[PDB]
Ligand binder design. Structure first.
Ligand SMILES: CC(=O)NC[C@H]1CN(c2ccc(N3CCSCC3)c(F)c2)C(=O)O1
Lengths: 193, 191
């Protein structure tokens, strides 16, 4: 239980400058102070260590958003979307290596692909519901179907925050991505040509 | 573009419609093109190199199409015809598009190829935004390059999700209207 934390902390540290494939099971066992076979009391494989790390990061975001879902709407409509987008920016930005490794594994692991697909569907669904609620109150024009607008905005964030977190080029500079995304959500959700 | 080289590339693109590159053998490619296996290795060293040539061909088709409309309306239409170049070019080659995106995690050439063209299309977008600012048609909100980067990355992710049939995704029939709406509102809107 205490050695299990050691294995996860070692994996997250090692993933910062090495992909999971360049990480052996012996690597994690040494990092945790245990023999290699003793690892398998805690985890069936290194893939399961990544899955546990990703599940905790994803659920950290999920609980931070749901905390905002249960509490009154902010007088300031720009700031309500900024606070939601910032959960993603801060949660995943605090676990870049796991975020990166998680994205790579979406191609190879049905568990990872399902975790990420399901999380994105959940928060796209929530975004569509807030937009539709904004229309019902007259705060937002009835332009595009809410769920399609919400999907594209959420897909932009996934791609743009990942590009920023991985240091890719092209990419928005890290200190600027929050303002950039918020501007595009707010104008596309509240404007009409 | 040798006559047998085109048969290899056409066979590859056909087979990629329903099978990933990993389920396609060199023997699959040779037989489809009506050639021997050594003939195959006369033109390509690997099936990955076939994919790279295929993707290089569609990427550059989109680019050329984009430059000729740059070489030449209504505001919404400008951005729509521009976005449509990518929706139509990559939409006419969904198999190569799907395989191209998968190979970006394994092939540095594929990665660098895509990255180089995205930077070019992003810089182009920023300059057009800048010129709509210069003539007073667009407000000076975010820096043009940052706005251009998030919008182009949106299109990349959203266009791939449709062509790859993912969930979540925007239905193919609605992706152009969706993206056009977000561009024109975010480029021309303030507050
Ligand atoms: C499938 C894929 O990945 N596409 C990549 C990007 C490129 N791009 C893009 C670039 C330049 C413009 N121009 C066209 C003339 S007018 C001013 C804007 C444009 F509309 C769109 C996208 O939206 O997707």
């Amino acid at each position: 239980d205490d050695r299990e934390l050691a294995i996860l902390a070692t994996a997250e540290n090692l993933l910062e400058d090495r992909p999971l494939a360049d990480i052996s099971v012996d690597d994690l066992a040494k990092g945790a102070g245990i023999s290699r076979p003793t690892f398998y009391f805690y985890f069936p494989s290194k893939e399961a260590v990544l899955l546990t790390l990703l599940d905790r990061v994803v659920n950290q975001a999920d609980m931070a958003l749901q905390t905002l879902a249960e509490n009154p709407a902010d007088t300031d409509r720009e700031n309500m979307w900024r606070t939601g987008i910032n959960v993603f920016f801060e949660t995943f930005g605090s676990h870049k290596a796991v975020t990166r490794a998680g994205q790579a594994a979406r191609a190879t692991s049905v568990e990872v692909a399902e975790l990420w697909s399901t999380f994105m569907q959940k928060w796209i669904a929530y975004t569509a519901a807030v937009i539709d609620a904004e229309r019902d109150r007259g705060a937002a024009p009835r332009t595009l179907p809410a769920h399609e607008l919400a999907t594209a905005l959420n897909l932009m964030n996934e791609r743009t925050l990942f590009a920023s977190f991985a240091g890719e080029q092209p990419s928005v500079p890290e200190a600027r991505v929050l303002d950039t995304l918020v501007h595009i959500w707010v104008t596309s959700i509240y404007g009409e040509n």
